[PDB]
């Protein structure tokens, strides 16, 4: 979890941004358009501030 968050947190600012997540999904070859990743990010973003923080990320991985 910790290690995975750091991978996706490209700029190391303690958040996964939507753009960072789009880079992650593109690097993994996930069958999702950019728009669908934006929706995935938005759903993961519990507090709605535009960033996926570590707590929201762990709650994601619990799915």
Ligand X SMILES: O=[N+]([O-])c1ccc2[nH]nnc2c1
Query: Which entry of ligand X, Ca ion, none binds 44, CB below 5 to 8 A by partner kind?
Result: ligand X
Question: 23, 9 in Cβ contact below 8 A?
Answer: no
How far is it, in rounded angstroms, from Cα 12 to Cα 30? 23
Q: Applying CB under 6 A, does 17 fall inside the site for ligand X?
A: no
Q: Applying CB under 6 A, does 41 fall inside the site for ligand X?
A: yes
Torsion angle of C-alpha atoms 19, 49, 61, 40, degrees rounded to 10: -50
Q: Applying CB under 6 A, does 52 fall inside the site for ligand X?
A: yes
Which positions touch Ca ion (CB under 5 A)? 9, 11, 13, 15, 42, 45, 47-49, 51
């Amino acid at each position: 979890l910790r290690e995975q968050f750091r991978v996706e947190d490209k700029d190391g600012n303690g958040y996964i941004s939507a753009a960072e997540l789009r880079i992650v999904m593109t690097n993994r070859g996930e069958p999702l358009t950019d728009e669908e990743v934006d929706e995935l990010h938005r759903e993961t973003d519990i507090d709605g501030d535009g960033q996926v923080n570590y707590e929201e990320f762990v709650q994601r991985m619990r799915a």
